[PDB]
Structure 1
Amino acid sequence: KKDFSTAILERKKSPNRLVVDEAINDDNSVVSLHPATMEKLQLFRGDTILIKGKKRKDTVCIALADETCEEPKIRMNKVVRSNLRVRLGDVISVHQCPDVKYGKRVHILPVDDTVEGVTGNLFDAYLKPYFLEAYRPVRKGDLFLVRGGMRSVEFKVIETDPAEYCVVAPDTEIFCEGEPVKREDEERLDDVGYDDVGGVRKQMAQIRELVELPLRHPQLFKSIGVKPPKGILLYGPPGSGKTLIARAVANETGAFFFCINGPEIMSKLAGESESNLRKAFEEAEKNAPSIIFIDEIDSIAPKREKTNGEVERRIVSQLLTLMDGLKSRAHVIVMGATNRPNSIDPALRRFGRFDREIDIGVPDEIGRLEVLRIHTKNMKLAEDVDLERISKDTHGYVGADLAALCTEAALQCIREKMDVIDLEDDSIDAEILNSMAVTNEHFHTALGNSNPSALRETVVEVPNVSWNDIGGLENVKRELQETVQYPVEHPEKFEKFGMSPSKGVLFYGPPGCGKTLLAKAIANECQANFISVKGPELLTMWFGESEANVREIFDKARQSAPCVLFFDELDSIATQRGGGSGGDGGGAADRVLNQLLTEMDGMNAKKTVFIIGATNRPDIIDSALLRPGRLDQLIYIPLPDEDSRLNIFKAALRKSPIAKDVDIGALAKYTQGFSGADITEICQRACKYAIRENIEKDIEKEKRRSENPEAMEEDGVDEVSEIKAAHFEESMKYARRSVSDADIRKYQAFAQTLQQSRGFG
């Protein structure tokens, strides 16, 4: 087997590919190769080559060679490096140029910023001295730097004969006509490539496999027979990168594009909407391959009960009729981009039309780090930044929020330098502009002054907690591993025996004993997705998103296989159908519980979704959840004993100082009958008392310094402040037992009545 999920993004091994490296020659057209490398392409020193760039761009250079280079390296010139839209570590393709084709005239114009002091035409002074009889190749739209006197001027080719690229002949005599080139083009050279997107690598691979292959190799599909899909439907949290992904793939694939907008078409007068849609479709069709993107497709096609207007129904039905007309098959690939999948009229998700749904979710930690690394470039940031901590802090953040965070940090940086800047003057010294630098405290200030946008989403990612944190419970780990990891990791044994596994595990025990910790640990070990849903969450969404929200969760369960759906706090919902209970107060559970029961029975079709429960009141739970196929197996998590308390005490103080003055073995004797929450609380209270003692010691030292500044500095500065015996002795005098003897008696009786048939031995 192979990791084919992201294998389409791999750098394929071809003789044309070479790794981009730094260069040593300042010539605008000379590129240095390796003597053995030229043998692969049958090249020699002095020849002319074509080097491809990004977004269907390319340039033409002169192939040179040196023995200090490497085989995969190319040593691209810095100006040509900017021309090719590549950097260090990139891969570029090199081809031969049999067509030298000296051009009769080449139009070249400089940039406005570097021509300060120029009195007129720059042809004789700058163009001809380095291009007369030099036979240098030039490609349209490329930048090359030249020098004259002390003035360094960058020039861009405006026109060529042929228009692609040609060699500057001695007869290429021109004069500076017009002035279209401006410095403001610096930020608008090329909108988006492929590397300018991060965090959605899997979805980007899906889109690539769906779109780029049909648009570049229809022969394979025609041979196999299956018609490629057309309608992609990107959906996700607002401002998560949908338009960016669509524009990236469209510009990189080289196909035609037609960026339709929702309100823009809805802004047209009646009759003009249909005409504009027809013009868009016809323009796309007449220049196949084409891509039609419809931003905010939900705006022009809402749900039926919310679009009773006549013209709205007219435009919706015209869109439907045109969409069913995709039989034209001119590689027209509609890419709708909504934000809520329920908001689109379900008539747009039948066979044909939009045959796909791609969920662009909130990026994970590595995705946030990647997008921050993308945005932090092209800024005068200092060399003491720390992106890892920033990425760790930011949670519930989408790409737009981080784009705003970088701007906020820069704004704080410019605000902090206003002490010298006076707004009474209309001019500012260049030193202030050149002295700007960004530090980590600026990012902390920006983060403290910013707010996330998507904390409410049901985030899905593999958890981090491992069995090391787990405080003992080896029997439960042994059972849970063979009940969860084996049926997914090793289904071959199950299918050979032909006895299908069950997909329900239920936890019941006293509060705070490692239920959620166990669920997250088993989710992390199996490397499966984890979806935590609470009782309060469902109870609130039953009034926020009505009943359908519940189904949405299971839908999100079945679109992210393999999945571990953890229904935390089932005691609020799974209460038994009390006869005396009535009204809304007693019947609120009577809807969510029934919807859950209906969904669980249909969930048995999949073989990669595992449902885990959690309760602290095993007696009040409804019997309907104990039917086979539903959450059948009941696993009891008891109050940890002496050795388990020792293990949890060991696991609690991993980050805290040594505190070796107290043997942790004696602690378990003290804390008999304490749950895990009480042990963690005791650790936290001891740490807080240690912090208070260190704070008062520091205050005493500062007071001593203030009383006598002449007094020499002592060793009373803030130390590590290891936790001492007095800390625990004082801390454990206020604690309490979270579970009384009556509750543990109840749990023990509940276990006893469930374990009365142990007579076999």
Structure 2
Amino acid sequence: PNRLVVDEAINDDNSVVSLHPATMEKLQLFRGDTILIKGKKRKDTVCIALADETCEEPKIRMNKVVRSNLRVRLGDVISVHQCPDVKYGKRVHILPVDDTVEGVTGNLFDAYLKPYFLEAYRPVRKGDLFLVRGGMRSVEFKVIETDPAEYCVVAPDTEIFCEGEPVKREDEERLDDVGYDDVGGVRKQMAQIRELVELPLRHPQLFKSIGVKPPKGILLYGPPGSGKTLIARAVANETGAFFFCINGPEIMSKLAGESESNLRKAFEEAEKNAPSIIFIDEIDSIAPKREKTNGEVERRIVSQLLTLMDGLKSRAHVIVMGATNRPNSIDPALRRFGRFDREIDIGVPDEIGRLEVLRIHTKNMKLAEDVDLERISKDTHGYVGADLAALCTEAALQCIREKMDVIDLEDDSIDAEILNSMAVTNEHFHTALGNSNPSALRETVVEVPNVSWNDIGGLENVKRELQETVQYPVEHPEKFEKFGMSPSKGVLFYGPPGCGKTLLAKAIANECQANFISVKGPELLTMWFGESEANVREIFDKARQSAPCVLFFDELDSIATQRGGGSGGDGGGAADRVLNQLLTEMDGMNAKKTVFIIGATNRPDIIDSALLRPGRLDQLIYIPLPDEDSRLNIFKAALRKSPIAKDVDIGALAKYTQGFSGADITEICQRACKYAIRENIEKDIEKEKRRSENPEAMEEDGVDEVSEIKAAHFEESMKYARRSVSDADIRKYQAFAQTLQQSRGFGSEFRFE
């Protein structure tokens, strides 16, 4: 009941805050009393509480000065507590700001602070700041100390002293220290880090009572520039702990022997200021993977770090947030128990994450009212937070582009009106996105695709089979345990190319709210050719951590074909590095883990039999070419976004177009739109020709013909319709299906006595 949302106050007084009267009564607060307000970063202040009926019950109204004192902004939640112990200040030490005092002659205390505090009884707390108006000028002042040493009410008898050095504005600006609100896209990882760190440091008594050892080592791996360094500072500043940052490059740049001294001094000081937090930024430079151990200094520093981590103790109240790009790049010795046990994945932010990052970076800029950040977030895929900030900067630069023609470069001074008139526009963001480049495109994206069964056309048999094999063991696993039999840990999709296998996998993933991971055979093939086969184990690991998950191995037959499969690439079979590693990881999967794996192949006769053995990937399901209703569904899905002429109903065309794959459907629509598109541009060109004939002829309000996609252009498109799959390929597929089926005899001949 004592927590309220910050809101703008009617009164601009620095030492006065407004609260809703009933809310004050609930807290037993009276008008004019001194109240202690706690904000962010464990920073609190003292203000005079006044009743304001216009202020909402769950809201607290206060001005910019108190907002700065509490380190909070609009919309933040702050706590108000009774402070009847505020004693009248015997002496208060307050000093001004360096820039605000230039041009003022005499004692700044007498000019501003003496009348500002005389008979005003304004409460003041150590480190508080405020703005005082006097002599046509406003001068900032910072409270250095108070007689009680916590806070006091400056009375007329209070001796206010302003003898000291001026306060620097640039250094003062650091008071807007980072909090949880200044980061985004890491909500879940943010919760994990906040828990694992803030809990022991702020409330170690819980762990002591439960008699557990809170972790010391935390490892934050992810993509560069994702915001790793900001999370640690936010956490440390919110817990009020002493944060000491170490950068790997900085340590490695020091002379031999000096790096160890700096590291030991860091650990020693951090332990002194417990609770403390240590961030080994870019630990890869300090302790890179042992691919080659060249020299003696590198080994000395890595071993020094190891022994320092081991020697640290739980009672020391110290936490070491490492940082890197990929966990494998770190030396394994650091990941042993005791040094670095917990690992967190600060992965690429999702659509919502991109939205929050954009809103965070663009809050301080002069955005236009037509800015549509949701569109930018939707169109930004593979963009890390830093890339989003770069995009915003590029958009502002493009706005400047548009604003250069008026502003003369040779003039040292520029009109203020033009400066105030500048503001980015959505089109500027579009241009910046067009010019910018993503930094993360080959990283496995783990998210819940939006594809639903409605987008899946018919296939009731396959729908049922896959729902059976996957949906249940992730939706009702407890009863699977009740009966206890092992569930199927795999399945293989064989069917014609371009029939929507990935769509089926994503739809089944979405139905179960399970993460989907898309891995294509070419990527694993490249990594093996790159001698980075550990990437396969990395894929399996990631799929495991993000359980429940659906690991989709796209073009499983690509690797076998590279070796040969069944066509005879090499003299023999298909097994190789990547395939054998895949089998090894498959047999090593945990039965209790909800990591279902799906394999898609356009050629089932070439797949190595060892992969089809039970226990790895045994369920085989046939995906037929779309039938009448399936083809209707694909047609409407492809034209769902586009308008069609009323004369054209696509179900009629779907009815008779048997034997044509979904890809052919997509291309028929593409070509139909394309021909209607030529029609549209031809009409536009004829209009331009007519206008050239009669440029002065005022354009009457003639209703423009509705540019639709008509049936004639569908005819023209189907004139170039294709069917990639022949009846011979389907004959091969059904031959495989028959070799699989082999079901007869006891369909109805069995019955008990």
Do both proteins adopt the same fold according to a TM-score greater than 0.5, normalized to the shorter chain? yes
Q: Distance in 2 between matches of 1:702 and 1:273?
A: 73
Deviations 1:155-197 (CA, angstroms, capped at 9, x unpaired): 3334433444222232455576566334445753323111111
Moved more, 371-380 or 710-719: 710-719
Residue 720 of structure 1 deviates from its aligned partner by 4.8
Residue 710 of structure 1 deviates from its aligned partner by 2.9
Residue 417 of structure 1 deviates from its aligned partner by 1.2
Q: 1:587 to 1:56 in 2, by over 3 A?
A: farther
Q: 1:436 to 1:178 in 2, by over 3 A?
A: farther
Give the secondary structure class of the aligned counterpart of 1:74: strand
Give the secondary structure class of the aligned counterpart of 1:62: strand
Matched-pair contact (CA < 8 Å) for 1:468–1:651: no
Residue 349 of structure 1 deviates from its aligned partner by 1.0
Moved more, 338-347 or 79-88: 79-88
Residue 115 of structure 1 deviates from its aligned partner by 5.9
Give the secondary structure class of the aligned counterpart of 1:159: strand
Residue 210 of structure 1 deviates from its aligned partner by 0.7
Unpaired runs of 5+ residues, structure 2, are: 748-753
Q: Distance in 2 between matches of 1:579 and 1:691?
A: 44
Residue 557 of structure 1 deviates from its aligned partner by 1.2
Residue 398 of structure 1 deviates from its aligned partner by 0.7
Q: Distance in 2 between matches of 1:359 and 1:475?
A: 38
1:504 to 479, 486, 490: 490
Q: 1:650 to 1:67 in 2, by over 3 A?
A: same
Q: 1:723 to 1:579 in 2, by over 3 A?
A: closer
Q: Distance in 1 between matches of 2:38 and 2:530?
A: 53
Q: 1:580 to 1:32 in 2, by over 3 A?
A: closer
Q: Distance in 2 between matches of 1:55 and 1:579?
A: 62
Residue 247 of structure 1 deviates from its aligned partner by 1.1
Matched-pair contact (CA < 8 Å) for 1:258–1:280: yes
Moved more, 286-295 or 502-511: 286-295
Q: Distance in 2 between matches of 1:127 and 1:101?
A: 19
Moved more, 736-745 or 688-697: 688-697
Structure 1 outlier segments of 4+, above 6 Å:
576-588
Matched-pair contact (CA < 8 Å) for 1:694–1:718: no
Residue 659 of structure 1 deviates from its aligned partner by 2.3
Moved more, 566-575 or 643-652: 643-652
Residue 544 of structure 2 is aligned to residue 558 of structure 1 = yes
Q: 1:375 to 1:187 in 2, by over 3 A?
A: farther
Give me the TM-score of the superposition, normalised by structure 2.
Answer: 0.94
2:36 to 38, 50, 53: 50
Moved more, 171-180 or 125-134: 171-180
Deviations 1:554-604 (CA, angstroms, capped at 9, x unpaired): 111111111100001111124598699999897885221111111111114
Q: 1:43 to 1:753 in 2, by over 3 A?
A: same
Aligned residues: 747
Residue 284 of structure 2 is aligned to residue 301 of structure 1 = no
Moved more, 313-322 or 151-160: 151-160
Residue 675 of structure 2 is aligned to residue 660 of structure 1 = no
Q: 1:673 to 1:548 in 2, by over 3 A?
A: same
Matched-pair contact (CA < 8 Å) for 2:96–2:166: no
Q: 1:644 to 1:486 in 2, by over 3 A?
A: same
Matched-pair contact (CA < 8 Å) for 1:576–1:621: no
Residue 120 of structure 1 deviates from its aligned partner by 4.4
Could you say what the CA RMSD is over the residues aligned between the two structures, in angstroms? 2.4
Moved more, 683-692 or 607-616: 683-692
Give me the TM-score of the superposition, normalised by structure 1.
Answer: 0.93
2:700 to 695, 714, 726: 714
Query: Which residue does the alignment assign to 2:379?
Result: 393
Deviations 1:602-637 (CA, angstroms, capped at 9, x unpaired): 114342100001011111111112211111111111
Q: Distance in 2 between matches of 1:580 and 1:469?
A: 34
Give the secondary structure class of the aligned counterpart of 1:716: coil
1:165-176 → structure 2 map (5 Å cutoff)? 165-172=151-158
Q: 1:543 to 1:483 in 2, by over 3 A?
A: same
Q: Distance in 1 between matches of 2:566 and 2:509?
A: 40
Q: 1:486 to 1:588 in 2, by over 3 A?
A: closer
Deviations 1:686-726 (CA, angstroms, capped at 9, x unpaired): 11222221122122223322321332324567665121111
Matched-pair contact (CA < 8 Å) for 1:507–1:613: yes
Q: Distance in 2 between matches of 1:610 and 1:501?
A: 10
Matched-pair contact (CA < 8 Å) for 2:631–2:655: no
Q: Distance in 2 between matches of 1:187 and 1:385?
A: 29
Query: Which residue does the alignment assign to 1:213?
Result: 199
Residue 646 of structure 1 deviates from its aligned partner by 2.2
Q: Distance in 2 between matches of 1:421 and 1:186?
A: 33
Q: Distance in 1 between matches of 2:697 and 2:664?
A: 45
Q: 1:373 to 1:337 in 2, by over 3 A?
A: same
Q: What's the % identity of the aligned pairs?
A: 100
Matched-pair contact (CA < 8 Å) for 1:529–1:563: yes
Q: 1:227 to 1:245 in 2, by over 3 A?
A: same
Residue 276 of structure 1 deviates from its aligned partner by 1.9
Q: Distance in 1 between matches of 2:279 and 2:170?
A: 28
Q: Distance in 1 between matches of 2:672 and 2:701?
A: 24
Q: Distance in 1 between matches of 2:365 and 2:106?
A: 34
Q: Distance in 1 between matches of 2:62 and 2:115?
A: 24
Q: Distance in 1 between matches of 2:531 and 2:422?
A: 48
Q: 1:408 to 1:664 in 2, by over 3 A?
A: closer
Q: Distance in 2 between matches of 1:121 and 1:418?
A: 46
Unpaired runs of 5+ residues, structure 1, are: 1-14
Moved more, 643-652 or 515-524: 643-652
Matched-pair contact (CA < 8 Å) for 2:561–2:569: no
1:361 to 312, 337, 347: 347
Give the secondary structure class of the aligned counterpart of 1:306: coil
